[PDB]
Symmetry: C2
Amino acid sequence: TPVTLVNLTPHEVILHLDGGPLRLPGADVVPRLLLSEGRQETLAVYDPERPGEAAVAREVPIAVGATWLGIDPPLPEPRPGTVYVTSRVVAEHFPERTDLVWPDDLIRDADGQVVGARRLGCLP
Amino acid sequence: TPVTLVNLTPHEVILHLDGGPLRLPGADVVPRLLLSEGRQETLAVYDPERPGEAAVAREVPIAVGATWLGIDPPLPEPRPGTVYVTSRVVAEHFPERTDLVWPDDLIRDADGQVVGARRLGCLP
């Protein structure tokens, strides 16, 4: 009746729990999110050092509507009694999957590094 | 006809552009996203060091459906000829606002620090 957590992130997940820490090793892969280059446009922007002067304004690339296509190593298929630890953004893109969670309520150290998650998160 | 960019992030934005770099100073504030604690539940999880043994499984807090309420310093009102630089997540939560952009196509240094954005992004 308990589940096996499977870490699909490249980083060790440390869960800070009442019973003491629980470590999920990172996965031996480099996940790539498969984005699509949106419509490439331009935006004229004042130089902050020359706020009034349109003459020296810059033309700034603006990518309208960068879209998601999937993930480069695909998600494993569901397996009874398995829960997959991924990112929130990956979970948000597969709302139909109730077996996806992400680390949440993070603990950072003095150098700003995550050293623990106090809980998991999931969609409604 | 050019726009003033206003940085609503706490960090300097460096735009890496064909005409040379463009720096937007960070804003003098600490933005807080106003989340709501979702429904707090529990999930029994095997100890990875004891994969078969339900006896020593852990009960892991799982927050179901953490929801957005807004932002702690509210967004400025729209102003003709002003474009606001925020995060993608903030932009995604205000789809009706066409004056919100985020830094995109980031350049990292050897220590992994963002040292430039090659473009801006915005919603459809």
